[PDB]
Write a protein that binds this DNA or RNA. Structure first.
Lengths: 91, 60, 118
DNA sequence: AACCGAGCCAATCAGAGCGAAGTGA
DNA sequence: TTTCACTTCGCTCTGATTGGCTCGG
């Protein structure tokens, strides 16, 4: 479970690598920090979506709940960009 | 340095997440467990035994 | 408005680059032929992080799909924001302090106050 | 001078993906 | 009773995990 509370570090560190110049290096420190930030990002947004689902007496968190939670929590750019992505997944 | 007022849209969820992480810290001790040198004994022993080049790299 | 978070707290060249990156993300998410089996992050591990919350019961396949994409954009824009501080200090190595410095520029990152203490 | 630590390499096997079966509202 | 929408099962197969050395900082 201790490895399960984060996304795999190699996957996170690869995305960081592609974000930086070819000559750039990343401290193990920074990879672990990013790993912790990403996991909080998921849990923070999920918690907001989860509480609204419990209030409306719905057992299932869906894509639309994640987008609504993103807007509520001040990730408006994320929600708006992913809105088209969800509708194309559903068709 | 901790501010009194943070992002108004996030503050209440931040408090609830602090409560949620405290409860996971009580039951699993995960917030303070720390990181193991390696996750898996099998993958460790693998890496240790593997044929290596003179530069300490895994061989071609 | 909706896109304030893209440029929030950034100056000069950094503003143009992050805006161009977000226009690149928007163009990609608006594209018509996605393969929903191709992601940088595993869906099962995203779903496990969500299920760490005992308040969460059942999760639609939609949610980890949105997060896979969302988390990529998050990691990318924060790493690009953090790199600014490495360049400021004439370093080729990204350090934890570079991420901490980046978080302080936008209130969008306030939810990480406990993950990366100030 | 001495020290610190991230990239480099690729094979195993933990586990991610997936179809089938199980669950319940 | 069947249907719907998820979980859990069973299994196949793949890509994340992994450390000794170098040499710039």
């Amino acid at each position: 479970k201790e490895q399960d509370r984060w996304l795999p570090i190699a996957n996170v560190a690869r995305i960081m690598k592609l974000a930086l110049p070819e000559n750039a290096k990343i401290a193990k420190e920074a990879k672990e920090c990013m790993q912790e930030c990403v996991s909080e990002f998921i849990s923070f947004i999920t918690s907001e979506a989860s509480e609204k689902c419990q209030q409306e007496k719905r057992k299932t968190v869906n894509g639309e709940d994640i987008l609504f939670a993103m807007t509520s929590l001040g990730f408006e750019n994320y929600a708006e960009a992913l809105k088209i992505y969800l509708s194309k997944y559903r068709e | 340095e901790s501010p009194l007022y943070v992002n108004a849209k996030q503050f209440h969820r931040i408090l609830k997440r602090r409560v949620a992480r405290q409860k996971l810290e009580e039951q699993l001790r995960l917030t303070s467990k720390g990181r193991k040198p390696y996750l898996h004994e099998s993958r460790h022993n693998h890496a240790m035994r593997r044929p290596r080049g003179p530069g300490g790299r895994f061989l071609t | 408005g909706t896109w304030a978070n893209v440029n929030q707290g950034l100056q000069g060249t950094a503003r143009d680059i992050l805006t161009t990156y977000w226009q690149h993300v928007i163009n990609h998410l608006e594209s018509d032929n996605h393969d929903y089996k191709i992601h940088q992050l595993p869906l099962a591990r995203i779903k496990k992080v969500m299920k760490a919350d005992p308040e969460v019961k059942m999760i639609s396949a939609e949610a980890p799909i949105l997060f896979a994409k969302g988390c990529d954009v998050f990691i990318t824009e924060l790493t690009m924001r953090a790199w600014i501080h490495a360049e400021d200090n004439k370093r080729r190595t990204l350090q934890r302090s570079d991420i901490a410095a980046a978080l302080s520029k936008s209130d969008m990152f306030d939810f990480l106050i406990d993950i990366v203490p100030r």
